[PDB]
Each structure stands twice: as C-alpha cells, then as structure tokens.
C-alpha cells in the first residue's frame, strides 16, 4: 500500500532508506542464521560433535549482528512513527479547514472523527509493530530459499517453489475466513431487522392496544427464518483449517522428500535432519503473517480512513459594502437538488430576506455567499470576484454570519462574543450586548461577560445561545452580514434581539436574513422567495403581499396560526 510511504515526511527520507536497508540486512541475516543450521546440525548429529563449535561461533556472531541491526531498525521505527504521527495529524489539521463543507457527510464526518481521534496510538507504532514483523516474515522464506540455492540448486528450487504455494495458501485462508465472517454477520443482522422494527414502534403499537399480534408475527417470522437458518453450512470449514492443513502437509511433503533423497543416497542422515529443521524454519514465518492478519486489517482500515481525510476535495485558491452576485447557481447532495437556477445581484448597502420552505436551500445560499463551499454550478462573486479566488485573509474577513445552530465553542461569554472581532474595544462589545439583548443575561450572571458559559459551566437555553450568536455576527467588521435563525416564541428576547441587531447595527454593510416568523422580515428591503431551490418570487414584503402570490398565502396562514390558541376555536 502506497499510502504509508506517502504519510512519511520529506525530512525522514534519510530514515526511510536507512530503515529499508537495515530491514533487508536483518532479513538476509535471519535467512543466513537459519541456513547456517545445515552445517551446524550436520556436525551436531554426525560422528564429530565437536566440529559444530565453529558454526556455532558463526551463528552467535550472526545473532549479535542481527541484534544490532534490529535495534537500529526498531529505534528508527519508533522515531519515524512519532514523525509520521505528527506529520499526519498536522496535515489533517491543515487540510480539513480547507476541505469544502460538502465533504462533511455524516459518514465522512464519522471517519474524520475516527481519523483525528482514534488514530493516535496507531500511527505512533505502525511501522514498528506492523511493518517490521510483516516485512521481516514475508521475505524470510524466500531469503532462505535463495540461501539454500547456494547449497544445492534443486534444493533451493524445492524450497522456493513452496513460497508461492504457501503465500497463495495464506491468501486463500484470509479470503475464506473473512468472507465467512462477513456472511455470518450479514445473516445475524438480517435476522434482527424484525426486532428493530418492533422495538422502534412498540410505543405506537401499545397506544393502538395491538402489541400481542405484532409480537406473535415477529416471533413467527423468527421461527420460520431460523428453521431454514439451521441447515446448509459450508463456507467456514476451509477457513483457518485450510492454512493449518497447508502448513502441515507442506512440512510432511518436504520432510518426505528429504528422506526420499536420503534413501536414494544423495544425502546423509545428518544432512536430512538438518534440512528438516531448516525447512521448518522455512515455514514458521508463515505463522507470523497469519497472526498479523487482524492487526493488518485494522491498520489497513485506519490508513484508508486517513487517506480519505488526506484526499477530500479542497477548495481552490486564487471596506465598504460589497455586492454579492449569483448566476445560475445550483447545489446538490448527491442527485438531490438543493438549488436550481438561482440568480441575483444584491446592490451594496441593501437588506434582503431569503424565505421559503425547509426543502429549499436558504442556508445553502447563505453558506455559498459566505464562501463555505464551491457551488456545484453557476458563479458566486464579490463585486465580480469569485469567492473561491480570494486570498484566505480576504475570504475570512469578507462575510459575517449567524448560523442556524449557535455553535458556541464552550468558552466564556466574552470569549463567545469576541470571536467576531478579538481586536475590537470594549465599547463595541457593549454595543453588541445592547443590540443582542444579552445584557439581560449579564443581569443574571455573577461575573457578567467573563462568566464561563460552557456546557458544564452554564446551562444556557436556546434564547441566550441565539442572542450571543447574533452578538458574534454584530461585533465582526465584515463588509457583508448574513443571518439565518430558528427563532421561536419560547423566549421572546430572540426576535427582539434580531430586530435590534439587523436595524440598529450602525456600520454600513450588505445584510441578509433567513427566518420563518412574520412581523420581523419587514426591515429587509427586498424579498427572494425560493421553492425547491428555485426562486419563484422577488420584490419587497408589502409588494409581494399586494401581489397576492405564494408569500401572501404564507402570510395569511402564519397569521391565522399565530393568533390561534388552545381551549376554543
């Protein structure tokens, strides 16, 4: 897999080469140490036991050289593991801010969470706990086959021909094991799809006083499915048994060949026994690769997730009121269209309202204006300058926004407000508190704006969260302002804060609002009704109301709902 070589920094190319060369040295040294058993054990079992000392001397010198080069490889492995951990994490942290928000799907977000968080202990020890064993046990059988080739070319051929056979055996065992486990998990999941359906709706069934028929139905389905589920099991039989049989029939075949040559006279008894021992050392590395299959699989999954983070589509790159322009803009998650033929050119200093049902892309429009994403089609410009083609400083300092969620970062209230402009003076903070109605919360808080408002610090309700979110956008000196809110009647300070914010903000800048309620989008100079991602109406509030279009019917229905109450008509 080429990903692991991509993760390593350019600094440590002097450690990658010095790791690969020393790993090859350790592999060749292990192969020589295994092959040195031939004269050693030949002298051991023969009628000259003392002759084996010299080959024991060579073996122990070989072992100490292996100790030194293995220490070097493991030290460089740990050091390169820390280096690649730092490189991977910092590249992820430098990538994701530049990753377009389209990439952050729920599954992609989950994989990014795992990559940032769960891949800590792994990358600190991938190259030392996986690559060193794997590479040192994958190249040792072939290395011993090569080494025996210098003792007898037919013997080396006999050893090396089995390496391909046994690697094919390992591949077959892995396939037939993991596929069997996949099938087992699939069957277990499919059987339990009934119980999920029952459990989710069992309150609705109880309200319908029909729980017993549903339970009987699901039990009958379970019994019927299990009746066929307890027959015809074949797949897992050649699983681990397949490799456990391959790595024993190979041993018996090679030992039988050795003794066949012994009776044939080409070899002596000591040579036959020593060759049996070496042809057992030939087989032991295949066990280690089998034991590394789960760790290798998990590391392969984590490296795939890290490559997903490191391959997300990044956004390319290239103080009065600006003009924000839209030209045939479209956006879609998959094939589901969110925006369809949207075009506008809002003049500087204007105030506009983007309204419509939740199926439209109002927040999509605001995020595209703010430069959170590259639009799927069309062009979004700042006075003719495409948002993606700005310097990062200009792009970040171009637009101020109030999100649907509050997105409080668990800091203090002053910290929660000052992210709009940390360089601003306390007077601007006071103006933000006055307009956003958070001063009512300052009346409650002990320390005021310095009080911690974290999740464990203060249990702020939705109204306080949205008011401080409004203050965030108010504080920033961005030449463009946007607002999308989910204000309700739960806390009436929310709409008052919004009304004061979008009106009393003294700075000159383009403003946009997205909201559902009535009697507050009056202050917007223009209106852009959107249906299913396409603009259907345009004009002022009163203009559209007089026109008697979709906006008028929406106004009438929401007015009827607002005046409604419980207890009578």
């Amino acid at each position: 897999i080429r990903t692991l070589l991509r993760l390593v920094p350019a600094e440590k190319r002097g450690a990658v080469a010095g790791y690969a060369v020393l790993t090859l040295l350790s592999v060749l040294l292990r192969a020589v140490g295994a092959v040195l058993l031939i004269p050693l054990l030949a002298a051991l079992f023969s009628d000259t036991p003392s002759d084996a000392w010299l080959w024991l001397g060579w073996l122990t010198a070989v072992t100490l050289a292996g100790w030194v080069t293995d220490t070097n490889t493991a030290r460089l492995g740990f050091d390169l593991g820390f280096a690649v951990l730092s490189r991977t994490q910092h590249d992820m942290a430098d990538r994701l801010p530049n990753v377009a928000m389209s990439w952050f799907t729920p599954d992609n977000t989950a994989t990014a969470r795992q990559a940032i968080a769960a891949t800590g202990p792994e990358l600190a020890g991938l190259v030392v706990n996986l690559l060193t064993p794997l590479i040192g046990a994958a190249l040792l059988p072939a290395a011993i086959g090569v080494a025996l080739l210098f003792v007898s070319v037919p013997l080396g051929l006999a050893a090396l021909a089995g390496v391909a056979v046994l690697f094919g055996a390992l591949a077959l065992s892995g396939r037939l094991s993991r596929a069997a486990d996949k099938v087992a998990g699939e069957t277990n999941s499919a059987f339990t799809e009934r119980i999920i359906e029952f459990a989710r709706t069992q309150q609705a069934l109880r309200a319908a006083r029909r729980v017993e028929p549903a339970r009987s139905q699901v039990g009958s389905a379970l019994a019927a499915q299990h009746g066929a589920g307890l027959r015809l099991l074949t797949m897992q039989i050649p699983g681990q048994v397949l490799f456990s049989l391959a790595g024993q029939v190979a041993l018996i075949g090679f030992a039988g060949m050795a003794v066949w040559l012994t009776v044939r006279g080409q070899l002596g008894v000591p040579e036959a026994i020593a060759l049996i021992v070496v042809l057992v050392r030939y087989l032991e590395p295949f066990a280690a690769i089998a034991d590394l299959a789960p760790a290798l699989e998990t590391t392969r999954a984590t490296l795939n997730r890290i490559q997903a983070v490191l391959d997300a589509p990044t956004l390319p790159a290239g103080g009065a009121a600006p003009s924000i322009e839209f030209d045939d803009v479209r956006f879609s998650y998959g094939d589901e269209v969110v925006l369809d033929g949207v075009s506008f050119t809002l003049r500087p200093g204007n105030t506009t309202a983007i309204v419509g049902p939740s199926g439209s892309g109002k927040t999509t429009i605001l995020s595209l204006i703010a430069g959170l994403q590259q639009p799927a089609s069309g062009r979004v410009l700042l006075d003719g300058v495409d948002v993606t083609t700005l310097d990062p400083e200009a792009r970040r300092a171009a637009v101020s926004v109030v999100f649907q969620h509050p997105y409080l970062f668990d800091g203090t209230l002053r910290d929660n407000v000052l992210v709009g402009d940390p360089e601003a003076d306390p007077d601007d903070v006071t103006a933000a508190m006055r307009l956003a109605r958070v001063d009512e919360l300052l009346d409650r808080l002990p320390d005021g704006d310095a009080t911690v408002v974290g999740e464990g610090g203060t249990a702020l309700s939705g109204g306080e969260r949205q008011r401080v979110s409004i203050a965030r956008a108010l504080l920033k000196p961005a030449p463009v302002l946007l607002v999308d809110e989910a204000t309700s009647a739960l806390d009436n300070a929310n709409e008052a804060a919004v009304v004061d914010a979008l009106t009393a903000d003294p700075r000159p800048r383009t403003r946009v609002i997205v909201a559902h309620r009535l009697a507050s989008i009056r202050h917007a100079d223009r209106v852009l009704f959107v249906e299913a991602g396409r603009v259907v109406e345009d004009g002022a509030i009163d203009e559209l109301l007089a026109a008697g279009g979709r906006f008028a019917q929406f106004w009438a229905q929401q007015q009827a709902a607002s005046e409604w109450a419980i207890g009578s008509t």
């Binding site: 140490g33 051991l44 036991p49 003392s50 084996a52 024991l56 122990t60 072992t63 292996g66 493991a74 030290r75 740990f78 820390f82 730092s86 928000m101 977000t109 969470r113 940032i116 800590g120 277990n188 059987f191 339990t192 359906e197 459990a199 069992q202 309150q203 609705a204 309200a207 319908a208 006083r209 039990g219 379970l222 019994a223 099991l233 048994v241 456990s244 041993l251 018996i252 039988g256 003794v259 008894v269 026994i273 057992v280 066990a287 703010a370 430069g371 101020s400 000052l418 992210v419 709009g420 309700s461 965030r472 009647a489 739960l490 806390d491 009436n492 929401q558 109450a565 419980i566 009578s568």
Partner: protein
C-alpha cells in the same frame, strides 16, 4: 461476569464440549512435530523403508483426523449457537413487549441497535469463534511447554529467560507510566469530543476563525506531545522488549543451551530436536494468549448488556372521565426528584394545560399521566381507578396520547390509521383523515391510501404526525395527553396540524404540555410548576390577576 454468565447458562454444556474438541484439535495439529522427532530417531537407527512408510502414513492420518475434527466441530458449534441465537432473539422480543414505554426514551445508554444487533453478533463470535480461539491459544502454548519439558527440562526452562525478561520490561514500562496509562483513555475520549466539536463547529472556524482554529490545533498538539512525551522515553525499553521474544533470539539461546550439552554428551542430539521444531516460536505463542483472551471480554460485555436489558423492571399491573393527581412524586435517578408533591384534578371534558420553566418535569408529568412510568409516591386516578391497576388493553383505551416523535407503522395508510380497530372500513379511515386535515395530501400520493409506510417514506415529519393524530381519532378515549411542541413542529403544516389536534381534542379530557404562554388564553385550566412543585393554580384571568410567576413570564414575552 455474573450477568454474562447468567445469559450463557443454557450454553455451558455445549461450550464445555467445544473447549475439549478444540483442545484436542490443537494437540493433533502439533502431533506431526512429534513424529518428525520420531523420524529423526528412526533415521539415526536406520530403519528400513517399511517402518518409514508406516510413520509417514501415521502422520498424514493424524493430519487428516485433525483437519476433519475442526470442520466437524465448526459445523456442530455453528448449529449449537444458531439455535441459542434464535432463542435469544425470541426472548428479547417478549421482553421488549413488557418494558416501560419510557425505557425506549432513555438517555445515557446504548442504542436499541447497539443492544440487540451488535451485542448479538459479539455473542455469536463469543461462542463460535472467540471461545475456540481462546481455548486453542491456551492449549497450544501449554501443550508445547509440557512437551518441551518432557523432551529436556534443561533447554525447556531456558525458554523462560526471554519470557521473564519480557514480563520484567512490560512491568517496568507500566509502573513508570501508571498515571500516564490512567490518563491515556481519558485523553483519547476528550480529544474525540474535541474533534467532534471541531467538526460540527466547522463553519464558525471557517468564517469567524481566529481563536477557534488555533485552540483546536493547540489541543491536538497537546495530545500529540502528551503521546510523544509518554512513549519517547520508553523506546529504549520497548525496542529491547521486542528482540527478546523474536524467533532468532529463541533459536540462538536454544542452540547455546543445547550444543554444549550435545558436544559434551550430556543429552542425546535428538532430545534437542523438539526445541528446534517447536520451541523457536514459543515466544510468539505466549504473546497470542493475550489476544486470545481479549476476544472473550469483548463478547462478555455484550452478554452483560443484553442481560441488563433482560433484567429491567416490567410494566406491573396491581389489584367519569376525571383525571386526578394526588401527592405525585417521581424520581428519575435514585433519590433525585423532578416532580415533587404534585396534586391536581382535571374535570371531565376540560382542555387543561400546564406551564413552567423549561426543564421542570412538565413533559415528565404528562408522560406519567400517560403511564410511560410509574410514580414512586402518590397515584394518578383516572375515573377513580389508579392507572397501575389497569392493563395495556384497558388503560390505553381510556388514556390515549400523541406525544412528540410520531412513529409510522408497517402497512399502507388504511392499516396505519386503523391500528386500534383494524376492522374499520376505508370510509371510516377517510373521514378520520378529513377530520385530521391529512386526507388532502394522502389523495395526492400515487397509490392513494395504498402507499406503504414503515421505517421511512416520502411523508415529512408533520405529515406522519398528522397520520398519528388520525390514528388517535380511532383510538377513542375520554382522556388524552399531548405536547404543544407538536402543534408547531412543522411550520408548513402548522395550521393543518393545529386544526387536526383541536378536532381530536374536542370533547375529551385533554392534557397538554404548554410552552407558548399565549396559547392558554381560553383553556379550561392552567397550572404552573417549579422544581417539581406547584406554584400557581387557576384559569387565565385568575393568574393574570395574581401577578405571579405566569404574569412575569408572559410580560417578558
């Protein structure tokens, strides 16, 4: 594990047989490494080819025997477990039909899928894979150890020098990082939460930026530096910890311990041969015990969770349309009341609403009236009978409810509204939908009322909520319970939902969780709750004249 052991009670006898069959297979798969020693003995003795062929047939026969036993035991264990899985899936089905209805709205606990699907797969792998693996991984090293001890106790005991060194190094690396080891899982979870916040809070960093990006990167760098400072000093320990177990070191120490004995004539050269065959990979064997036993805990946790689900309390039955409440006290956690001494009575046919600050037991009280739970003290008497004495057939015929999170049911719209009375005709369902202001949309569907509903469909949240309201029409009760948030959860369908919920409310002892203070202007009764206790009781005008909590709250909005 007590709960896990109790769950696995009916599998003890088969699993004991598995733990013997696999212990046998493990020995049979190590048998040829004994017959190779025998073969070396014969070749030293120079036996004729007939005895050689006899031993070669013995070895291949044992290999076939051990390859057939594993297949047979796998086949048998995959049908031992496959019927216990059916028994468990059929037992959880009965348990799910007897839990309190608030159990499925639990918080701080595993999801239903994580409780019934994943915890059954991790039990299937506890029985069929992990117990065979974990008995094999203990039989193999211990059988190898005892065989090598039989061969020669001298070179056998020398195998423990690297094992002792490895254990000493692991212990020394553990004691010097006890605080760090304790902190590491906690820091991992904390950084997982921080990464989640950095990801869901991405737009603020993207637009506002500044302190947020630097703060997240600072926390990530602090975690990285914590890991590096933790494990960098132990590289000296952790490298020499790996060489000691490597097969090359085992081979070298085997030969250094044996070759002097062979040359000095203190042990026959064939007694050394078993160590060469088997004792080289002995280090990598004991390192497999830990991974083997690690596969039992992962499934024992799942068994514990499913048994915990099976041990939950059940919806017990003990022993004029007027809902009553007397000394109602309810505790979520042990000794943590949220409702405290609530006494209330609702006259028949009166639309009643209760208000208060968010998070004051209002929805909990409404659910308790609906019997999603049972009060610790007091009693809710509907028509003079305590709710605890009525069955699910009787109580839920007297007290219907449409709370939040409306649930669709399998089948078409005709058999989704008529769950209470499936014998009802299509015309009754159609007029119920007309009353529920949902007949207009259902007719626009391509299949009309034959459109199949279930886990998901083309209907929005408000539309399925209206379908559940229409179902509540057919489930006629003198009493009802509701949540006002459903009245405006869908802004597009808010008006139709309001008309539908009002039409359902007509001439019924309806209780509502009221949040918008202006919606109770002409209700039949109003009540206020504070920290689980009553503060204000009266109608709209009476509480307006009171000037208390309700007046202050409404003057704020």
């Amino acid at each position: 594990a007590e709960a896990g052991s109790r769950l696995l009670a009916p599998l003890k006898k088969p699993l004991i047989v598995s733990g013997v069959l696999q212990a046998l297979i493990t020995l049979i798969e190590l048998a040829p490494f004994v017959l190779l020693v025998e073969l070396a003995r014969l070749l030293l003795g120079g036996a004729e080819a007939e005895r050689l062929w006899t031993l070669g047939l013995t070895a291949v026969s044992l290999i076939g025997l051990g390859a057939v036993l594993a297949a047979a035991m796998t086949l048998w264990l995959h049908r031992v477990d496959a019927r216990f899985a059916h028994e468990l899936r059929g037992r959880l089905l009965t348990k799910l039909s007897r839990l309190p209805l608030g159990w499925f709205t639990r918080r701080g606990s595993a999801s239903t899928k994580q409780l019934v699907q994943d915890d059954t797969l991790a039990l299937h792998y506890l029985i069929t894979h992990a117990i065979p693996d974990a008995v094999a991984a203990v039989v193999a090293p211990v059988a190898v150890l005892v065989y090598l001890f039989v061969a020669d106790w001298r070179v056998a005991l020398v195998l423990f020098i690297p094992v002792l060194v490895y254990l000493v190094l692991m212990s020394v690396m553990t004691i010097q990082s006890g605080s760090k080891i304790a902190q590491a899982p906690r820091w991992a979870e904390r950084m997982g939460g921080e990464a989640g916040a950095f990801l869901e809070g991405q737009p603020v960093i993207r637009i506002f930026g500044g302190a947020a990006a630097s703060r997240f990167r600072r926390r990530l760098d602090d975690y990285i530096d914590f890991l590096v400072s933790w494990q960098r000093p132990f590289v000296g320990k952790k490298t020499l910890m790996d060489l000691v177990t490597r097969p090359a070191t085992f081979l070298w120490i085997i030969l250094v311990a044996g070759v002097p004995l062979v040359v000095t004539g203190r042990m026959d050269p064939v007694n050394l041969l078993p160590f060469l065959l088997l004792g080289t990979t002995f280090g990598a064997r004991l390192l497999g015990i830990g991974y083997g036993l690690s596969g039992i805990q992962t499934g024992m946790l799942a068994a514990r969770r499913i048994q915990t689900v099976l041990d939950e309390p059940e919806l017990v039955v003990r022993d004029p349309g007027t809902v009553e409440l007397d000394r109602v006290s309810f505790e979520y956690r042990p000794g943590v009341p949220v409702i405290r001494d609530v006494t209330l009575t609702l006259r028949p046919g009166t639309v009643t609403a209760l208000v208060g600050p968010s998070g004051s037991g209002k929805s909990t009280l409404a659910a308790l009236v609906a019997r999603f739970h049972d009060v610790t003290q007091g009693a809710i008497r509907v028509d003079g009978r305590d709710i605890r004495t009525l069955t699910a057939d009787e109580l839920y015929r007297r007290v219907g409810f449409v709370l939040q999170d409306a649930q669709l049911v399998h089948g078409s719209v005709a058999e989704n509204i008529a769950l209470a009375e499936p014998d009802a005709g299509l015309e009754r369902i159609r007029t119920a939908a007309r009353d529920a202001q949902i007949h207009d949309r259902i007719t626009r569907m391509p299949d009309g009322y034959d459109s199949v509903l279930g886990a998901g469909s083309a209907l929005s949240g408000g539309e399925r909520q209206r379908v559940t309201i229409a179902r509540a029409i057919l489930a006629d009760t003198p009493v009802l319970v509701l949540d006002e948030a459903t009245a405006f959860a869908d802004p597009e369908s808010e008006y139709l939902v309001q008309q539908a919920i009002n039409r359902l409310t007509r001439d019924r002892t309806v209780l509502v969780i009221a949040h918008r203070l202006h919606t109770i202007t002409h209700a039949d009764q109003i009540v206020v709750l504070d920290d689980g206790r009553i503060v204000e009781v009266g109608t709209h005008d009476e509480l307006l004249a009171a000037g208390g909590r309700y007046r202050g709250l409404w003057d704020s909005g």
